[PDB]
Write a protein that binds this ligand. Sequence first.
Ligand SMILES: O=c1[nH]cc(-c2cc(-c3cc(Cl)cc(OCCc4ccccc4)c3)c(=O)n(-c3cccnc3)c2)c(=O)[nH]1
Ligand SMILES: O=c1[nH]cc(-c2cc(-c3cc(Cl)cc(OCCc4ccccc4)c3)c(=O)n(-c3cccnc3)c2)c(=O)[nH]1
Lengths: 305, 305
Amino acid sequence: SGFRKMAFPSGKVEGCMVQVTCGTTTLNGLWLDDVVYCPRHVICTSEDMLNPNYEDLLIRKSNHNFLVQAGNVQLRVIGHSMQNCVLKLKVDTANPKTPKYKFVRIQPGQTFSVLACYNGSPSGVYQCAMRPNFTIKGSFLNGSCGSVGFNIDYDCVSFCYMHMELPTGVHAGTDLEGNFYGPFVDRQTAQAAGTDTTITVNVLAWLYAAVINGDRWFLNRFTTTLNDFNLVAMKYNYEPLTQDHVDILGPLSAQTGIAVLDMCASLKELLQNGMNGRTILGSALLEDEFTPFDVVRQCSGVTFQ
Amino acid sequence: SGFRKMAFPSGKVEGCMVQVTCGTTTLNGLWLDDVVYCPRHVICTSEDMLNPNYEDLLIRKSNHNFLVQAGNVQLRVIGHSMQNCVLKLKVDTANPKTPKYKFVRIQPGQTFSVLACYNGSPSGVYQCAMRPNFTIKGSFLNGSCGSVGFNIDYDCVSFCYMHMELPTGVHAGTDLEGNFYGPFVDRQTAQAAGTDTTITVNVLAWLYAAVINGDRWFLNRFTTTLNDFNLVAMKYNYEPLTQDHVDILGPLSAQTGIAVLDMCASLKELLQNGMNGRTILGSALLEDEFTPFDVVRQCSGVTFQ
Ligand SMILES: O=c1[nH]cc(-c2cc(-c3cc(Cl)cc(OCCc4ccccc4)c3)c(=O)n(-c3cccnc3)c2)c(=O)[nH]1
Ligand SMILES: O=c1[nH]cc(-c2cc(-c3cc(Cl)cc(OCCc4ccccc4)c3)c(=O)n(-c3cccnc3)c2)c(=O)[nH]1
């Protein structure tokens, strides 16, 4: 019993964090096999940030200008290249703590764990989600650039996120191939996020989690249709629900005996009437950063090693 | 910017989790140096649980009846003893991944990270707090017994929590010396929790976190006194605020320029009028599982290794 915002165990990723220094800038890198990955703006000064020409700035950098420190392990840089918005530094030592891993570009709505690091040292871990406007609502301070987000399937780490804080206080970054999520660029120039809508399939998954845990007050006598529900979602800035989403919710439907469309009718009533000062799973608002997989994992206890 | 429920990086503790089997029961143990710590009800059957005499049940157990597996490392048990409600198993190998650690008995209101484990394998990490009734609102399934809670100061792991789920769905356990928090006993017999009050000093710390992050709508024109505020806390099942608590909040007071007693007056108005459908740091209720230290760490970026 109980339902918590739960991150993956971070140990497999902690062994990969290093500090990367170029001139006077220091941020975090990801050391996997004999390559170190970090944001390319490590080569910039605060002044370079307004309109950086990264190809031109890289001309004046050689291997020995990049200092990489793994704790106190000093790493020798033997090559460097730029791939989209990440720098890839070839070092002469394979990381002996490299886990089984893959790089994945996640879709909006998907969740992941963040290991926030500073000066190459992990400081905390938390859960968040790729928002529909391709920002994340993280917790990051200066020096956190190069911190990574990931999921873990048994023994394999799936890295999905690595760059900046917008003036609005939300966060933008890349996949591990260096392509930004959404339209953001690594330049200090006007960029605004776009509508932050609610991840409907995740809210439904969390209502199923609530039923499994005994929070049942929101179940009602009604049902609805996909098209009728989606009219309501549009009014409340909820993402449309698709048949694919209904199928993904099938296992939770089968565990609880509540058809997806009946749960949609409960969500519809919650969106139109509010929670009336009540709570669900300890929350006074509808939570949208648990995926269906998140709910099954935490309500079934799958494990990783 | 941003404020998240943030756990410590779990890697130092992951290397200490093992599986402990006795007869047909399997749960988690903590392997530190050459000792394995686990809940003593590993020696019980489901029937033993109603009224177990642990001293008598232990008579029929020898070293070879305890199977300890560290991943696939098979550990040889060379001694066993019972300390209060934990079993201590002496093994013939020191854990090479033992971190610097201490055992600490925490006070109600204090927070810690939980590494939920099953069959000796970590499955997720989250934050929670010792409630004033000495339960914790965890997320645990069958097989999670022996999972531990901890804090980390730079390189030293402070283990504070290790046992059962009450019929109400909240959780009870011991410190690493085997003494339960609060009045609970490791027996399947009627036990009820006691009033769950709100941790006032933590709520104030979280309001300071909100101000630091730009959530300022709840700041008002008023102030109050310690005695006047505490009359309001009592009415709303909030813990009394002491002068010691005011001093602990001093650094946040100094960072924001808001006297503690003015912040109390803002909290008073929030308790009497509610949030009026607004949110603070993404929450529609007053959050009480961030300590003042939690707020400073996350708003200053302290790091651990
Ligand atoms: O030695 C270092 N110098 C700099 C950083 C660093 C750099 C940035 C950074 C990097 C770039 Cl290309 C651009 C940028 O502004 C773009 C967003 C924007 C748009 C419009 C107006 C203003 C801003 C910001 C940053 O956000 N942060 C940051 C701050 C808080 C949370 N997360 C990231 C940190 C670092 O870790 N190390
Ligand atoms: O092989 C194993 N057998 C058993 C366990 C186990 C044992 C218990 C357990 C252990 C004891 Cl002495 C007593 C007990 O009931 C006491 C609380 C209570 C009071 C009144 C009525 C009912 C209950 C419960 C448990 O909660 N859980 C549990 C369940 C969910 C979350 N957390 C813990 C697990 C295990 O991990 N391995």
